[PDB]
Write a protein that binds this DNA or RNA. Sequence first.
RNA 1: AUGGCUGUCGUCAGCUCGUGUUGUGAAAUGUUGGGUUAAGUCCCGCAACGAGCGCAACCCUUAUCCUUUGUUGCCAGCGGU
Length: 218
Amino acid sequence: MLKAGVHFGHQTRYWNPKMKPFIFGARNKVHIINLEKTVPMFNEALAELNKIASRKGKILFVGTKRAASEAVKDAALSCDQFFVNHRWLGGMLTNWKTVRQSIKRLKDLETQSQDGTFDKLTKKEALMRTRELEKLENSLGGIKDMGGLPDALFVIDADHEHIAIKEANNLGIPVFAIVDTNSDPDGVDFVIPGNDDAIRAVTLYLGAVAATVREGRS
RNA sequence: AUGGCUGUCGUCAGCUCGUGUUGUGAAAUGUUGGGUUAAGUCCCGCAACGAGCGCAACCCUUAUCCUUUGUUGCCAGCGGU
C-alpha cells in the first residue's frame, strides 16, 4: 500500500552496513529506504500473521521510544493482544519462571486494592502500596493475563529493544521487527525496513498489524 | 580431636542465594550508576528479575495525658488537735 508515508531514512553518518539492500543516499546527508522493496516484505509478514493469528495465538508488541510508547498500548487493546510499552524487564521471557511470580504479585493486590484492605494498615502503607503497583503496572500491565510465552513478537526499533529480540532467539519465538538503517537485521526473522521514531509512520505500520489480526481471527 | 558458652572487628552495613543472561573458563551481573539516608535507607535508571540473613520496626525503661483502683501510700477543701 505505497501511500504518503514518512519512513525514508534514519541518518547517513553511521547506518549499518548489513542494511545495504535498502539504501538511497539523499543529498541532505540522509539515507532513504527503498520503499518498493519494503512492501514486498511488509505484506508477507502480515501474511505470516494470519498463519499465526488463526492458531489462536498471542501476539506481543514491544517498543518504547518515548514516542511510540503509548501508540502500542491502544493498538493492542484495540485487539485482545498483549504489549510491553514503558520499560522491558530483562528476562521476562527466558526467566518467565520468576516473572510469573511478579504478575501474580500484581493481581494478588490488584484484587486487594480495589475492594478490601487498601486503607486498613496506615496511610503511610497506602503511600507506598499505591506506589508499588504503579511501579509494576507500567512494566507488566499488558502481559499480566497472557499466562504463557508468545508465539510471535513485534518490535518497533530493533537496536533500541535488542534485549527483547535476543530473548526471542534463545527459544524459537519468531520475532519480526520494524528495523531502521542503523539497526541490525540478523536477529529478526521477518525483517521489514521502515521508520522507528516517527509518529504517523509507526501508526501506519502498527495500524496494519492491529487490523490484520482481528480480521484474521475467523 | 570436640560440643556448649564467650571475646573481637562492631550495632560496623554489610553477607549471600535461586533463576535468567554474559564469558572457553576462574567468574561477572544482580549488590554497579544518578540522588538520598544513621543504614544494601528509599527513589529513579539499568540484563537483570526476585528472595534470604542483617538494617529499621516489634520488646523493656524513661518523658506527657486520660480511665480504673485508693491500702500499709496521699492531704486540696473540710472538723478536731
